[PDB]
Scaffold this active site. Structure first.
Site, PDB file in Angstrom:
ATOM      1  CG  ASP A  92      -0.339  -0.273   2.514  1.00  0.00           C
ATOM      2  OD1 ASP A  92       0.859   0.042   2.695  1.00  0.00           O
ATOM      3  OD2 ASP A  92      -1.036  -0.816   3.396  1.00  0.00           O
ATOM      4  CG  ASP A 270      -6.195  -5.551   1.739  1.00  0.00           C
ATOM      5  OD1 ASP A 270      -6.708  -4.729   0.950  1.00  0.00           O
ATOM      6  OD2 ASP A 270      -5.961  -5.269   2.942  1.00  0.00           O
ATOM      7  CB  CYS A 308     -11.667 -26.338   6.967  1.00  0.00           C
ATOM      8  SG  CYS A 308     -10.105 -25.469   6.738  1.00  0.00           S
ATOM      9  CB  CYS A 310      -6.455 -25.735   6.840  1.00  0.00           C
ATOM     10  SG  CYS A 310      -6.884 -25.679   8.599  1.00  0.00           S
ATOM     11  CB  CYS A 313      -9.501 -28.574   9.914  1.00  0.00           C
ATOM     12  SG  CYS A 313     -10.119 -26.950  10.380  1.00  0.00           S
ATOM     13  CG  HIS A 339      -9.288 -22.603  10.546  1.00  0.00           C
ATOM     14  ND1 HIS A 339      -9.877 -23.565   9.753  1.00  0.00           N
ATOM     15  CD2 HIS A 339     -10.280 -21.750  10.898  1.00  0.00           C
ATOM     16  CE1 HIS A 339     -11.165 -23.300   9.621  1.00  0.00           C
ATOM     17  NE2 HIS A 339     -11.436 -22.204  10.308  1.00  0.00           N
TER      18      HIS A 339
HETATM   19  N1  LIG Z   1     -10.791   0.644   3.664  1.00  0.00           N
HETATM   20  C1  LIG Z   1      -9.577   1.071   3.242  1.00  0.00           C
HETATM   21  C2  LIG Z   1      -8.405   0.404   3.660  1.00  0.00           C
HETATM   22  C3  LIG Z   1      -7.125   0.825   3.239  1.00  0.00           C
HETATM   23  C4  LIG Z   1      -5.808   0.128   3.665  1.00  0.00           C
HETATM   24  S1  LIG Z   1      -5.542  -1.560   2.976  1.00  0.00           S
HETATM   25  C5  LIG Z   1      -6.006  -2.460   4.452  1.00  0.00           C
HETATM   26  N2  LIG Z   1      -7.090  -2.165   5.194  1.00  0.00           N
HETATM   27  C6  LIG Z   1      -7.111  -3.037   6.203  1.00  0.00           C
HETATM   28  C7  LIG Z   1      -6.092  -3.901   6.176  1.00  0.00           C
HETATM   29  N3  LIG Z   1      -5.431  -3.440   4.999  1.00  0.00           N
HETATM   30  C8  LIG Z   1      -7.037   1.942   2.379  1.00  0.00           C
HETATM   31  N4  LIG Z   1      -5.829   2.398   1.946  1.00  0.00           N
HETATM   32  C9  LIG Z   1      -5.678   3.406   1.162  1.00  0.00           C
HETATM   33  N5  LIG Z   1      -4.472   3.767   0.805  1.00  0.00           N
HETATM   34  N6  LIG Z   1      -6.718   4.100   0.701  1.00  0.00           N
HETATM   35  C10 LIG Z   1      -7.964   3.796   1.026  1.00  0.00           C
HETATM   36  O1  LIG Z   1      -8.928   4.426   0.609  1.00  0.00           O
HETATM   37  C11 LIG Z   1      -8.203   2.614   1.952  1.00  0.00           C
HETATM   38  C12 LIG Z   1      -9.473   2.181   2.378  1.00  0.00           C
HETATM   39 ZN   LIG Z   2      -9.155 -25.494   8.913  1.00  0.00          ZN
END
Ligand SMILES: Nc1cc(CSc2ncc[nH]2)c2nc(N)[nH]c(=O)c2c1
Ligand SMILES: [Zn+2]
Ligand SMILES: Nc1cc(CSc2ncc[nH]2)c2nc(N)[nH]c(=O)c2c1
Ligand SMILES: [Zn+2]
EC number: 2.4.2.29
Lengths: 372, 372
Positions: A92, A270, A308, A310, A313, A339
């Protein structure tokens, strides 16, 4: 393999299933990316992450630029070599976590200045610096640096942030392109903003397509708006993005949210939900999540989930894992996390198979009936 | 395999190398037993413990009788099935940890009453109850219930505790024998007491041999007396025990202590040192231990130890593990623990090979020169 190649093998309504080919490997979509906080997927060896079926993982740029350091990771050979994961890694931009985890943030058109929630030091993250840090990490999929909009947001504030984000998207694109090694070996994803406003989302998509990116993320969601609202925004937002490129919904992890998002055209996900679930004791099952710490699991010889596949499990009972978590044992976290990540990968596999087979709608219906 | 069979294949001075055959497997001696606190070898899956070369592990009776419960573990199928370790398991009597970790202990000739350091509940552990709990756990090697002597101890107090321990050794033997399944499938070890006094140690050994046990432990050491003193007591104490049975030195884990103890006739060891080392950041190397958290390891690309064959040393660097530990990441503990346990197993293998080959004295000399 090429630097980047997204191919759609099958479709059903707005849903798609295909593959992304990159130098470090193939990514099957829809894909779920396990999250690596500080250069580690919480409580799991990289070989274990791969065993669950994960094709790609996410790396937290914000934490990495602070804890070990971007320049240090580069000196050591890059993130892949450092943590032992040789497949693709999406990083990110660090902008979101800067507004969420850091102190005394000072924002401007150049970027954002902030203080570390660790040592109390100061840094100046900008579109150029973010792109540079991701390069130093050796990222395969680089996220453009943007300015996320807090929920709820007024039309004028949402327009202002969206417009700034688009200016920053152009700066990210140029920074990425000026670095030969990065432009030739990695991919760059642009991020759509505009809060819950359709006209803003449309302006963002057009600006993003005009610049041109390898993939497009729908940012600004899963920020407290609720599923109905999120789905409503996805209904009109995803169709605005180029059809032939990956669609990534950032920070969305609940199983039902993933299913709904795929039905709306999302290809990548993610979330720290699986990794944090095994922190408070939540284990995903096809019958809904269960809190393993509850007294009802103290003498339950059954595995976490009945179907599952995995290793957890196959080898251990709910009773044992219940004991481990309540005892605060590290093995409890290891087992719960493995898991949960495996469950998510099996969910993505079932989604991919159902789309390829033209029975995704039925799968979504069956999944919900049982899960809820 | 038989219920129990100890065979000595080679000797060098007081040192011995051989095997113990039990129903669940073969134990190569000298052996080092990794410690499982709450039905888990800290931060490691049982398959990983076995991969390091461990033939047997130790189970903490005190914690198990409290946290999950002896009766509950029995209802669930026994410790082996519960935690997923199918090889031999030696369980301590719980008497030591009762005096160290529990509150308001009331001692008598019957046993000891105490309050849990967890919920604040109360229990009455005696030779009979201890033997019963170990049976409920499904222990392979059962330790007789004794009364450890605090260091330093006066001759009269040491004699009194030693004599009580011998009376309790007889009660443990009878309790074990009256339970058919346990007598036919498990082994029973007696524990020698007498503090640092030779005449007391001799009286203890004679009483123990008179009753008759499958193995003999040297208890009351590694309680703050120092290595020189410990070695001095071992010099006269070990020869007092039956030669044809295993000699187990309880709670001794430092590498140099193990080498010295083997030179004095000890066949078995156990210790939380390896598991706690990977808690504060200590990693064993052939050049002595290192604290991975130290700044000098921040960009050190070399593995923990230059010749160690463990998976951790094959795949990750000191730099990465340094980062993980300082970041408080679970993977850091997993990696440190696996290496340390593997290091200990490699140490035992080198000891066994050198004894079999008639070059143990040389090995001990070479090991110390480099380690210190
Ligand atoms: N909801 C959300 C989550 C993330 C982080 S990625 C992440 N989120 C949780 C774990 N990993 C976001 N990141 C950026 N850069 N911009 C966004 O608008 C944005 C919105
Ligand atoms: Zn499992
Ligand atoms: N030093 C020592 C250690 C232990 C615990 S086994 C262990 N120690 C540390 C980890 N595991 C002992 N246990 C008993 N029952 N009796 C003893 O005399 C005694 C002495
Ligand atoms: Zn190693």
């Amino acid at each position: 393999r090429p630097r980047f190649s997204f191919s759609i093998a099958a479709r059903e309504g707005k849903a798609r299933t295909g593959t992304i080919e990159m130098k470090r490997g193939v990514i099957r979509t829809p894909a779920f990316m396990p999250v690596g906080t500080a250069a580690t997927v919480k409580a799991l060896k990289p070989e274990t992450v791969r065993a669950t079926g994960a094709d790609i993982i996410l790396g937290n740029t914000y934490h990495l630029m602070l804890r070990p350091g971007a320049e240090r990771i580069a000196k050591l050979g890059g993130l892949h070599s450092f943590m032992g994961w040789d497949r693709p890694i999406l990083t990110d931009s660090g902008g979101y976590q800067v507004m969420s985890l850091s102190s005394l943030t000072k924002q401007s058109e150049e970027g954002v200045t902030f203080k570390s929630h660790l040592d109390g030091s100061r840094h100046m993250l900008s579109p150029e610096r973010s792109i540079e840090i991701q390069h130093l990490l050796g990222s395969d999929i680089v996220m453009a640096f943007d300015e996320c909009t807090p929920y709820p947001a007024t039309p004028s504030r949402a327009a202002s942030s969206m417009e700034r984000s688009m200016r920053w998207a152009k700066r990210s694109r140029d920074a990425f392109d000026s670095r030969k090694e990065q432009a030739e070996n990695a991919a760059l994803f642009g991020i759509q903003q505009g809060s819950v406003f359709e006209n803003l989302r449309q302006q963002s998509a057009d600006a993003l397509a005009e610049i041109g990116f390898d993939g497009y993320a729908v940012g600004g969601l899963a920020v407290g708006e609720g599923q109905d609202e999120m789905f409503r925004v996805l209904d009109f937002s995803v169709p605005m993005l180029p059809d032939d490129k990956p669609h990534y919904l950032m920070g969305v992890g609940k199983p039902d949210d993933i299913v709904g998002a795929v039905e709306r055209g999302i290809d990548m996900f993610d979330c720290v939900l699986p990794t944090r679930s095994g922190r408070n004791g939540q284990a995903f099952t096809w019958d809904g999540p269960i809190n393993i710490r509850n007294a009802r699991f103290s003498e339950d010889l059954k595995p976490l989930d009945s179907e599952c596949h995995c290793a957890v499990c196959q080898k251990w009972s709910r009773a044992y894992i219940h004991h481990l978590i309540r005892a605060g044992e590290i093995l409890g976290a290891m087992l719960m996390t493995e898991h949960n990540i495996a469950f998510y990968q099996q969910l993505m596999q079932k989604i991919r198979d159902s789309i390829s087979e033209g029975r995704f709608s039925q799968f979504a219906q069956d999944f919900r009936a049982r899960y809820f």
